[PDB]
């Protein structure tokens, strides 16, 4: 079940392939803007691209099977880039939300008060990430696409061998 009501709705268009990916489906993410306003606003603004920079053309740069997919690095694409709409980093809001299971979209940070533009979608229950990562969304549609991204073959690191690229990101009004 959903931990909170969905205020704003965002969606991704996932493309897998090399060098130009083929579209595989749509991933719809509902944002819990009531509990975490700043993080949800940051994610929505990066999805729409109103600030100039956004998730369009970015890639899911870290995939661990049966654990998590992680992306949101439009700057460098290796995990060392990404800026929020406020600054380079912004403070962790609060940790009332919990990694309740698959489809949980949370913030990936270098540490406390170091949230940026990088997010990760969990595919299993991760109760060890609570009080350390800001959970701000839930995947509503396209979980099969998320599992398809997870099943991608990976190199010696965790980068997928085939580039999983977000072709077009935005909002779906409801």
């Amino acid at each position: 079940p959903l931990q909170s009501k969905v205020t704003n709705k965002v969606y991704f268009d996932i493309s897998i392939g090399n060098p130009v990916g083929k579209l595989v489906g749509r991933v719809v993410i509902g944002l819990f803007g009531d509990d975490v306003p700043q993080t949800a606003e940051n994610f929505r603004a990066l999805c729409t691209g109103e600030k100039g920079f956004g998730y369009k053309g970015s890639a899911f740069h870290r995939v661990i099977k049966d654990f998590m997919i992680q992306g949101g690095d439009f700057d460098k694409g290796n995990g060392t880039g990404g800026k929020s709409i406020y600054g380079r980093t912004f403070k962790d809001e609060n940790f009332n939300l919990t990694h309740t299971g698959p489809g949980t979209v949370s913030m990936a940070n270098a540490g406390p008060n170091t949230n940026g533009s990088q997010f990760f979608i969990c595919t299993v229950k991760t109760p060890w990430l609570d009080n350390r990562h800001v959970v701000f969304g839930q995947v509503l549609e396209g979980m099969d696409i998320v599992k398809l991204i997870e099943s991608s073959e990976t190199d010696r690191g965790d980068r997928p061998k085939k580039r999983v690229v977000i072709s077009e990101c935005g909002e779906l009004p409801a």
Binding site: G17, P19, V20, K22, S167
Partner: protein, 498 residues
Amino acid sequence: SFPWLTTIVVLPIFAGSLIFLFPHRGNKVIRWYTICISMIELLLMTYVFFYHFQPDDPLIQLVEDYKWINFFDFHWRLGIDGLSIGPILLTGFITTLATLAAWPVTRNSQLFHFLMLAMYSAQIGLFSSRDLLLFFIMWELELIPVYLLLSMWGGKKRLYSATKFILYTAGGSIFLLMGVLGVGLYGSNEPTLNLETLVNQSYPVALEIIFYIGFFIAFAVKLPIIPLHTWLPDTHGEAHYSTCMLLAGILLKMGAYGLVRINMELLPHAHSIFSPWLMIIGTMQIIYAASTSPGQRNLKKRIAYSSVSHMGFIIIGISSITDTGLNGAILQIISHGFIGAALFFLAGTSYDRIRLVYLDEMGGIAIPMPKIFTLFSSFSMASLALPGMSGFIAELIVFFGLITSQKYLLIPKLLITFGMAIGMILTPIYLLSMSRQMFYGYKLFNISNSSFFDSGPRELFVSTSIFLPVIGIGVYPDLVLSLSVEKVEAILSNYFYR
């Protein structure tokens, strides 16, 4: 079960590789062996078309699939349909007749006939290739034979023409290779180059447009499209007339065949985007070449610009999205392959006697040479879109395909219909003038030109054997159209709402 198409492709080049085992001098044994190979291959294609090709089948036929390279997922894949069998038969016919008409060649006859058989094999391999990289390889496999034929048996400016030809074709074909790489790597799981599975592929609009541009640059370099046509006048004007048969009858149609097979079939959305801009380009190409032709004093350059003008009707039939337009484009392909080759052959044979180039000094040739005058006049009439010939019915069917087209509404349908009409006013204006500057009038010729000067039995047979199908198609066009009415419909089936 038997590999018919593989045997057809392999046989000419494999037989020509053995032409160097002959220790004989001269050209007699070499040319008779080459014509034996050409006629055996022609009979083989005739057997294939008679017994294993079904014109009512819109699917691929006689397919053969052998995996050659695993990394590219690259297969030697061959297959024929209603689109390819016409060009294949035309290739065999024109190449055999060009081998027959290249008989006075006594300098390096072995290499000449080997290159002719290699050209045979390469053209047939292109026209029956169902793999994108195999298509690209067979496309590239003619840069060297045509270069050698031009540079060793051409005219006065043969070397510059050969260099320009090979550099222009390489410049187009690198864009062809980029398009091949882009289309063959779009697969999400594994690369694929088979045309059958690529005909169902779905692309975004921008990527489809980019791939279409990458293929269209190559197909506009090969099939002469303004302004990528500048290699053709000096390439065809300064080439051997036997090589001019293949250049103006077979190699020019390869760009159109690639346009139907790849641009029209594999990428229909980008083709629908680009076709209205192709119509204006084709009409301006007709007008531009039909106006450039009177400005050429050279006879062969005038014929080459006439070929550029005649390619505009093929471009129009391609861009007009109807079954009738595509049928007219195929009919014009066959008609031009029957007309331009014979015109170049007659020009070369006439030059072998008169030994003059510019039209303002070749008066009175009709007095010592009446039969070549008759053949030249008849093939000019065929060029003139005269009824009873294939050119008239091809242009008429292209006009009907434009008039019946649903993509364009009224005013462009007028301004294009008027457009090519201006072309068939300009097409007489030089052509008859050409004849008037090449055969009419009186000149005092030598007594030795009274006998053993006209066309012999061989040249008469060649001209008659290319002229007869022109009349046979101009009387009954469905001798050709019935081979491709079905498959063209399938090609059109992707252009409507689904």
